[PDB]
């Protein structure tokens, strides 16, 4: 078996290998990349997402989210407080202010320590889930706005035609902005491109050990657990690497730089934080290998988590008993 220790793998495709997205994903999995739950892809030196990021300041962040934490340093929840709209220009200025900017630090490892020690005492503001793309329309390879759709994948694999569309989202981050422990909707894949700015550190649990994370979460957030059989779908829970280690949860860490792709694999729990002002673009996708995961994916029973229009059809076809129960 390839990659038995479930390490995060890093790939360096040539411009020739970069031409067939599906085939390259299949290649990565033939080498066992999926066992980690997450892989890094460094694009060919000749490739570019777009010419420059010069005129992006007029993008609107209609609902910036202030991330307010509760709990203790290593085990906390965050809730999202809606703020008034601001442009990317204004946001960047805010990220750079004395109040919100990245602190002085000796190296990544010093910065990671500062994050987990001090995160809960601040409330950084995130521009999340903004529908759109920064890929140039003439960028033909690994253009996240030009991927084949999950609906077409399901149709090719299962022969059923369904409604729904699948488009990318932009994320504008600043120091300490946080994404909580989660897997994707319907345990789909995700692909994430860091277009510009400061790095993004990722933590990830191997899919074959996901239930171990869930069991720890049940113990650490006992109230949330009683309220919903799948509360990690609310995307509000954070658990530090120190606490994971203390409880024997297997996991790995890796830091993504501007110009790099990350791919998360079905049922690979992940979480992380931003080092400073940046902008990422991400979208979900599927392969034939995803189908069985989609069938087994756990759903939020309490109503807290949002179910997009397109997810409805996924649940209807892959999980008709749960769908009927929903009704
Ligand atoms: C691979 C890697 N790890 C990092 C940590 C901090 C800044 C840049 C980095 N790049
Ligand atoms: O970048 C973020 O804030 C969160 N991204 C993801 O969870 C993802 O791409 O799967
Ligand atoms: Ni994700
Ligand atoms: Zn719920």
Swiss-Prot record:
Catalyzed reactions: N(6),N(6),N(6)-trimethyl-L-lysyl(9)-[histone H3] + 2 2-oxoglutarate + 2 O2 = N(6)-methyl-L-lysyl(9)-[histone H3] + 2 formaldehyde + 2 succinate + 2 CO2
Entry keyword Plastid: no
Nucleus found in the keyword field: yes
Cofactor(s) it depends on: Fe(2+)
Swiss-Prot/TrEMBL keywords: ADP-ribosylation, Chromatin regulator, Dioxygenase, Iron, Metal-binding, Nucleus, Oxidoreductase, Transcription, Transcription regulation, Ubl conjugation, Zinc
Function: Histone demethylase that specifically demethylates 'Lys-9' of histone H3, thereby playing a central role in histone code. Does not demethylate histone H3 'Lys-4', H3 'Lys-27', H3 'Lys-36' nor H4 'Lys-20'. Demethylates both di- and trimethylated H3 'Lys-9' residue, while it has no activity on monomethylated residues. Demethylation of Lys residue generates formaldehyde and succinate.
Record protein name field: Lysine-specific demethylase 4D
Originating species: Homo sapiens (Human)
Residues of the full protein shown: 11 to 337 of 523
């Amino acid at each position: 078996a390839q990659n038995p220790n479930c390490n995060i793998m890093i790939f360096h495709p040539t411009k020739e290998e970069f031409n067939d997205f599906d085939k390259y994903i299949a290649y990565m999995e033939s080498q066992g990349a999926h066992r980690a739950g997450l892989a890094k892809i460094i694009p060919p030196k000749e490739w570019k997402a777009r010419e420059t990021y010069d005129n992006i300041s007029e993008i609107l962040i209609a609902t910036p989210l202030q991330q307010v934490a509760s709990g203790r340093a290593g085990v906390f929840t965050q809730y999202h407080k809606k703020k008034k709209a601001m442009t990317v220009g204004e946001y960047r200025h805010l990220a750079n202010s004395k109040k919100y900017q990245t602190p002085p630090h000796q190296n990544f490892e010093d910065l990671e320590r500062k994050y987990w020690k001090n995160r809960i005492y601040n409330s950084p503001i995130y521009g999340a889930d903004i529908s759109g793309s920064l890929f140039d329309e003439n960028t033909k390879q690994w253009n996240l706005g030009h991927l084949g759709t999950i609906q077409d994948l399901l149709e090719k694999e299962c022969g059923v035609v369904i409604e729904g569309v699948n488009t990318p989202y932009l994320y504008f981050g600043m120091w300490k902005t946080t994404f909580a422990w989660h897997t994707e909707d319907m345990d789909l894949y995700s692909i994430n491109y860091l277009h510009l700015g400061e790095p993004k550190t990722w933590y990830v649990v191997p899919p074959e050990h996901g239930q171990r994370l869930e069991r720890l979460a049940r113990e650490l957030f006992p109230g949330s657990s009683r309220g919903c059989g799948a509360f990690l779908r609310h995307k509000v829970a954070l658990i530090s690497p120190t606490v994971l280690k203390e409880n024997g949860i297997p996991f790995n860490r890796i830091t993504q730089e501007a110009g790099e792709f990350m791919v998360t694999f079905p049922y690979g729990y992940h979480a992380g934080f931003n080092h400073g002002f940046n902008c990422a673009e991400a979208i979900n996708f599927a392969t034939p290998r995803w189908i069985d995961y989609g069938k087994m994916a756990s759903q939020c029973s309490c109503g807290e988590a949002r179910v997009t229009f397109s997810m409805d059809a996924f649940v209807r076809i892959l999980q008709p008993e749960r769908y009927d129960l929903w009704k």
